[PDB]
Design a protein around this nucleic acid. Structure first.
Ligand SMILES: [Zn+2]
Ligand SMILES: [Zn+2]
Lengths: 114, 114
DNA sequence: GCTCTACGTCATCA
DNA sequence: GCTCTACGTCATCA
């Protein structure tokens, strides 16, 4: 009777988190902890975490869910990533939340003087 | 008995020009007219004619000969292109020889000031 | 006189 | 709050 790792109560896991992201997390807990379980588009991963296309395109590094592009079925598929994996990678790359914020400040300056 | 299109005499065609570039040209005529038949590396194509990697990577646009990279067999293969095909594409792209030199003149400032 | 592309950005088009 | 890549550069690393 395997239980959700957040609540330890539910036995029915969120189908995407479980099947695509290998996380034994129920839907309710996923909505309760978006800090860990929210899905981010490829574009949002680049904005929020400063990850690059080669990193996000690496099939071996992140699990990901693809959907039809909401703008047209003929455009490139939308790619969804789970915040806990992307963040963990980004913390490693930039040095914790501190390093990430520092990079953000640096980026903000290049924005100001341009 | 088919003849070289430059001399109208030789029947033995240069093996590369014939087999890879589909040009019925003898080796001797090829050295007598480098303006048309000299082989240019991918890097030289970019320097000389300002073609881009997507143009030069298009399997459908240019014939090409590949060789082992002379720096190391483990590096990416050297790619050779025949001057008459690359020049002809470039004259379309930039508008003849004189559009090409205009672009040459233009770029000479971008690195002169920089 | 060798080739690939990320770099740090972004528009555009898809 | 969509994605891919050309931008023209070029330095590295292959
Ligand atoms: Zn739960
Ligand atoms: Zn000849």
């Amino acid at each position: 009777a395997p239980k959700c790792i957040e609540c330890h109560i539910n036995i029915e896991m969120d189908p995407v988190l479980h099947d695509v992201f290998k996380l034994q997390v129920c839907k309710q807990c996923s909505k309760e902890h978006p800090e860990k379980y929210a899905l981010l588009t490829k574009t949002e991963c680049k904005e929020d975490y400063f990850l690059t296309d080669p990193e996000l395109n690496d099939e071996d590094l992140f699990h990901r869910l693809e959907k039809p592009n909401p703008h047209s079925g003929t455009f490139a598929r939308m790619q969804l990533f789970v915040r806990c994996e992307v963040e963990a990678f980004a913390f490693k790359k930039w040095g914790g939340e501190e390093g990430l914020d520092e990079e953000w400040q640096r980026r903000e300056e290049g924005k100001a003087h341009r």
